[PDB]
Structure 1
């Protein structure tokens, strides 16, 4: 128990059903078709339906939700953005020109020797990078007034077929006359983007960038150089270096460099060769430049000192942390299959247990597949939550219910039906104890699943869905309201909890409470 447990206005019990979405279509919908009298009552009158997929939860548009994202967003009281979504939003919304690390890098160049470099995979493959990110960067760098910009083009031959490079090269050249920036290197990813510690490969790109070791060319003719490579059966992935500009186009002493790939695994070696001691591993006859600073689109290794344009989200003052800071104790409970989700992920994506936080794990059943015991261990989770309600120790308690997602993944419709009936029973037992012991009950889900067990052709559908999830509230003194500018979403669950409890909301929660007092 924590010192301020008494100051709380309302004690709250939060049930996160796993894989329970709202769909009015009955075909293969195990939730609609199950006997679910408890949720039928809670999901009536004052209840909301909130988004748990796509950009509402920080995922690419149209992509289904999942347990890790779902619990992260539920616990955070804000949208947790996947890296790609963050960068594409920055491009769409012209946010690079005020990006803290990009501004820092351009200030560095401006107060120094004026020289900046851009390096990465240049194609529309979208696995490691996108040319659109490089274009957005060039435009921002120009607007920020950097004197000299050079581009190092790593040719793509795996994510964009082996003969498209000549087109991305032509596109880049045409782009640059913008009227700003100069192409300095072309080399295949086989050399620049090795991830198997074959530093003799890395050395070709390192020497190309530092020393101009390669075939000399200029903007005029560079496409013909590449065509000559194609005719000799040397494709994009494997292009040996082509050198444009002269020493001025090389990565020199005091220069600043930005890698624009957002996937770390194939950038660790080249970035480390430029900005740390791995140049020693290259065995280059060239001298390593002094006083370089390297920036990455994202964090490539925690051990690296490089600043990142989009570093890992700090995720400060998630609900669990804020309650501890407010001196309010809490309880998190799940069975084994979702135990990590209510702990590691619910608490912001890190291994941390906060002062006053008590955790409880219920063993999952030992069966080959969960359709053989569709009720799983929902009953035992219910037992532990009822025990906490009778104690009354913790003003905020929460649990996860596993059956709908885990049985949903089997594709067995009748098993999913039994799973939803057992889950509804457990919810009813918790609800009756909340009403006897003075807790307000909120039921949600992290994403849907069991409401869609059949594909259109009548076969199994074993995946999560994009349907909305419920949000219920037993307290009669509140009414659900929508946000001003967007649909309600999981980021709004935690702000709302705090409102009911009568606690302050931290600035870091950019979600909003979606209830009003009445």
Structure 2
């Protein structure tokens, strides 16, 4: 029957010479190793300008899957917004100004919330500073900040430095007050764990949660309990009289300064949806909010977008569809948005002929508790589909290296990589058995460095290059490639014409 071409993404799996804290290098990977030694291979740049990001900026699943599916260097939001600030266009943004005019004309308050760090994956604290400076320029009197603590795109216990700098900027600009602090685990969930979302929501709307007069004492107290940045319980900063600094009320305006959509949709829907059934927001939840999303999150969000989206035409999924091929997207919960929405160029709707399989990730708080996650279930489901001779193209993502690597724990991440290697062998061998070809690669690093040189947890991504193995004998792969060269390579193998929009180039010499 069909000789499928499968694009296999080992999420957060990069190549790094240094072996200290390197779960990728330390893991026993007999399958990956044999494919690497027996088939044509190379490495690709997955960071910085090569993927549409600022120089030196590490990649991530959004950036990576967008570039992989697009077959071209995809200009990223971080870069775009940084340039708007650099060129003096940020302050002229009609949406930001409308939000500020709203609060001034109706005598309400402006709330700013988002990830509080310079990680650059979901936000950048300098964008928050630009918004504070703009609010001051426009004469907005009441501005409240609801900080979402990081520890995932930066050090696990770095919140104090960001809070301190924010406090300095607030004093310098003469506007702003920190109202709440919440770990991104609660305020930025993407797994439909509504109990987590509700906690963040109630801290911001009802002033419910651990209370502190001093933001730094809130963090220190959490640390004393072994609860670091990412997991800080939604907390409420209170005034001298004990009342919350600020709760979100009717007719207020909100600017969510996150520019990556996957972790912003849930809390945004909670605030803007007329009909919300995931949980009872309470008869007195805020209504008539002027809600601003820094970038496009979802059509379901009743708000305004500051930096409008632009369609990515002729991405891999569209080309496959146009040529009448059947394609399958598959991954477990954690990377399902990436093999679907992001891979499709920032499009939720499936292309004609595109099927999707979602495998539920395990019900554990952190994945170091179950390194194998649901990889075996993903593999079992895919093997059945391959056996059925249904798909011409397959896009599979194994979330493990990345998801467990974010724990900053060496042994668990090694187990995650080894589990994925076992699954990789079954999938690739099955594909080869069908006369097909596999393109084994990754979207960015993570598991390659889960410990800092001093032995402490390294919970974020790395800037190391990703591997690429094409399981086809008799060919050679050129070096110096980028993520945007993968789609052209896949089309090359499928014998399909490459669209003009794909400025990337096939890796096959």
- Work out which of the residue numbers 409, 416, 421 in structure 1 matches 2:418: 421
Which residue does the alignment assign to 1:508?
501
Which residue does the alignment assign to 1:76?
70
Correspondence list, 1:143-292, <5 A: 159=129, 188-191=136-139
What is the deviation of 1:24? 1.4
Correspondence list, 1:126-145, <5 A: none
Aligned residue for 2:441, secondary structure, equals: strand
Relative distance call for 1:327 and 1:413 in structure 2 (3 A) is: same
- Work out which of the residue numbers 60, 73, 80 in structure 1 matches 2:54: 60
Within 1, Cα distance between the matches of 2:404 and 2:90?
A: 43
Within 1, Cα distance between the matches of 2:407 and 2:135?
A: 47
CA contact (8 A) 1:455 1:461 kept: yes
Which residue does the alignment assign to 1:29?
22
Which residue does the alignment assign to 2:470?
473
Relative distance call for 1:87 and 1:432 in structure 2 (3 A) is: same
Which residue does the alignment assign to 2:352?
355
CA contact (8 A) 2:330 2:395 kept: yes
What is the deviation of 1:367? 2.3
1:13 aligns with 2:10: no
Question: Gaps spanning 5+ residues in structure 2: where?
Answer: 98-125, 145-170, 176-253, 258-293
CA contact (8 A) 1:335 1:377 kept: yes
Which residue does the alignment assign to 1:387?
384
Within 2, Cα distance between the matches of 1:264 and 1:400?
A: 33
Which residue does the alignment assign to 2:429?
432
CA RMSD across the alignment: 3.9
Within 2, Cα distance between the matches of 1:415 and 1:307?
A: 40
Of stretches 344-353 and 77-86 in structure 1, the one that deviates more from structure 2 is: 77-86
What is the deviation of 1:343? 0.9
TM-score, scaled relative to structure 2: 0.58
CA contact (8 A) 1:265 1:300 kept: no
Q: Deviations over 1:190-241 (max 9, x none)?
A: 4279989xxxxxxxxxxxxxxxxxxxxxxxxxxxxxxxxxxxxx98668xxx
Q: Deviations over 1:367-399 (max 9, x none)?
A: 232112111111111112222221222110121
Within 2, Cα distance between the matches of 1:161 and 1:11?
A: 49
Within 1, Cα distance between the matches of 2:297 and 2:439?
A: 40
Within 2, Cα distance between the matches of 1:503 and 1:307?
A: 37
Relative distance call for 1:119 and 1:26 in structure 2 (3 A) is: closer
Alignment size in residue pairs: 335
Relative distance call for 1:357 and 1:298 in structure 2 (3 A) is: closer
Relative distance call for 1:424 and 1:235 in structure 2 (3 A) is: closer
1:346 aligns with 2:343: yes
TM-score, scaled relative to structure 1: 0.57
What is the deviation of 1:81? 1.1
Q: Deviations over 1:121-174 (max 9, x none)?
A: 49xxxx99xxxxxxxxxxxxxxxxxxxxxxxxxxx9x94899xx9xxxxxxxxx
Q: Deviations over 1:25-73 (max 9, x none)?
A: 1101111111101111222352011011111111111111111111111
Which residue does the alignment assign to 1:368?
365
Within 2, Cα distance between the matches of 1:463 and 1:440?
A: 32
Within 2, Cα distance between the matches of 1:51 and 1:193?
A: 46
Within 1, Cα distance between the matches of 2:389 and 2:296?
A: 43
Within 2, Cα distance between the matches of 1:66 and 1:42?
A: 25
CA contact (8 A) 1:189 1:237 kept: no
Q: Deviations over 1:5-27 (max 9, x none)?
A: 97xxx630111111101011110
1:49 aligns with 2:56: no
What is the deviation of 1:340? 1.1
- Work out which of the residue numbers 422, 447, 452 in structure 2 matches 1:450: 447
Within 1, Cα distance between the matches of 2:419 and 2:336?
A: 19
CA contact (8 A) 1:190 1:237 kept: no
Within 2, Cα distance between the matches of 1:85 and 1:387?
A: 42
Which residue does the alignment assign to 2:399?
402
Which residue does the alignment assign to 2:186?
none
Which residue does the alignment assign to 1:331?
328
Within 2, Cα distance between the matches of 1:120 and 1:399?
A: 38
What is the deviation of 1:489? 1.1
What is the deviation of 1:84? 4.9
What is the deviation of 1:89? 7.8
Relative distance call for 1:194 and 1:316 in structure 2 (3 A) is: farther
Within 2, Cα distance between the matches of 1:510 and 1:440?
A: 23
What is the deviation of 1:433? 0.7
Which residue does the alignment assign to 2:315?
318
Within 1, Cα distance between the matches of 2:420 and 2:334?
A: 15
Aligned residue for 2:412, secondary structure, equals: helix
Aligned residue for 1:480, secondary structure, equals: coil
